[PDB]
Amino acid sequence: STGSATTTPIDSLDDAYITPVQIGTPAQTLNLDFDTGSSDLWVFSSETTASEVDGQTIYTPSKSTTAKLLSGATWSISYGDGSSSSGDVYTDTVSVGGLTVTGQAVESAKKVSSSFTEDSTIDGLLGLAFSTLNTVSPTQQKTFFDNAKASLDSPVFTADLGYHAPGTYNFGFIDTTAYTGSITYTAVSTKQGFWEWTSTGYAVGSGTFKSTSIDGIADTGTTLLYLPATVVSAYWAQVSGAKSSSSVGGYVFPCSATLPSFTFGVGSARIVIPGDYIDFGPISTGSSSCFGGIQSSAGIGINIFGDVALKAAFVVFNGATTPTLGFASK
Template sequence: MMHSLQAVLLIVSLLAADTVAAPHIQKRSFVHHVKRSINRKDPAVGPNAMLKAYAKYGFSSVSRQTNSSAAAPAAGTSGGGIVAAAPEPNAAEYLSPVKIGGQTVTLDFDTGSSDLWVFSSALSKQTIGQHSAFDPAQSKSFEVMQGATWSISYGDGSGAAGTVGMDVVNIGGATATRQAVELATAVSQSFAKDTNNDGLVGLAFSQLNTIKPTKQTTFFDSVMPQLAMPVFSVDLKNDSTGTYQFGAIDMSKAQGPLTTIPVNAASGFWQVDSPTVTIGNQKVANQGGSPAIADTGTSLLLVDPQVANAYYAKVQGATNNAQVGGFTYPCNAQLPDFGVAMGPSYTAMIPGNAITFAQVDANTCFGGVQSNGGANLQIYGDVMFRTQYVVFDGKNKALMMAPKK
């Protein structure tokens, strides 16, 4: 079960230690780019992305026929930072370099969860395989969190679990000096097979953290007091490296002013109301529509069944393909633009030519908009993010959005 990621560029102000007087704050910028590989002709990519999303949120499985004690808040550098986010094949995940105790691993940034976990040297060599595994014995700053454990599991039986420690975590220059790091001592095959991804940086609210007996703060919550602004911004791209930026808003990436969208943080997610959809140039009410989560860790746009049906009714040759496990259509079909309401006054529009997620075969394509199976929760993933500049405001519990330039 992998979740989606992108690398980030950070502009960070370094603070001197409390015991040393600093004459001024020195600002620096850090950029790291990651190569990416796109394969749009893998027939399993689309259905697998859908299965992963369903399992992550515990949705009923997609039917598919086959032919066969609390730690002290982490301190860090002030200002902000950016790190590059590079898409995996079909942009199924966006992966970014992260330094833990001086060791670099490649992690998926996920606004739909709240754990920072990583492959560790405690796993067998066979399980580690081509992954970069964090070795706490090689870190001079690692501290064991006695008695602390963590575990994540999904509806398809996949998951990971392990122990916990505190260490220095650096993302593009933004640094938390005492961040809870969850070390995987067991992972399911689905995680082990994704050899490009060494773990996850959860960026939902800290209340969803799975550490026991006491939940710990996310990286963002840890560094937020030291950031120049209490925000991180996301600029994901389809065929090139994008950025996650902590502590700053880059208006050069936005087309027009940002619209502020209130978030219902009680669930622990970046959750918004989504009362309408736009198909082509027609805006319609989504009667009885479900709330929606802004989730960089999900590849697709999972919408209420009536919304998916209404959209693909406008696509010639589209069908809810039981053999594939989702909506497919001829690759030469003309797709209408699609928009989802984010709160009461903003609609995130996705051009029709940005809807296709992958090819199933030479003539059939798999849509980036799919049904949530009536799960009463819509998941707005990377299909939306690739067309929008999105700012996550941790202090005010809000999103700010604008179309990309």
């Protein structure tokens, strides 16, 4: 089997991407944030504290003939921005882009933090990291991809995120029309539960490439590119007026700037992020200070190749017995 679904930015800055997902019978369609950095499929639901729902579409298990309470199971997750959610668990039929999994754990939110309530465009998350990170207790649950894998034509999914435009998530096949040149594959460590890999270096603009190993994760659920402070300083030093602002919480730059590109290495191959991809606009409405799309990972504890980086590539998440990651230009 295969599946293919369009993913769409939630706003004009590509702050996140939502993908329609069918849950239950008859289908209830929710727009979920596909997150290769976590491993829980959770949804706003009829069980979510009413004051914490503000415009989201909810899953109502009682209206699904295929929903079953997973008795005794609970979940609770925190994310990198300090947001969180928790609840109980149903199993139900879940389909993405025509690909169907029966018995998928659907984690129903009883509580969500303010950041989730305030974002009316995201109805939940669909985690695509390794199932070892799944938070369901006392019986850990598998991701949608893990459950689908055996049925897939090939044990892969691909992320093809757009810049200020829709893109595609494919399951079970590699669309050879969706990228240019060849795909370069690179090793993955699953030791931390992530799609963790080592970039071979970077360049800033038309500058010379610096060969240096940068360990990090391929994370569709993070907006920006988070890299070591040395790398990030070298980038922003090429932008007149750019500075790290403690009050804003990262590098800012004059909105009048033209940003240089940023290149990262994948083996002997190179992915070029255009400068425009690194512009996240005014820090507040009407400001002439703009927020940068490359930020330091210092104090996160891991480097993160988030959407800023991934949307410059066609990315293969290869879930074969020995997992790997593939990157191509597009």
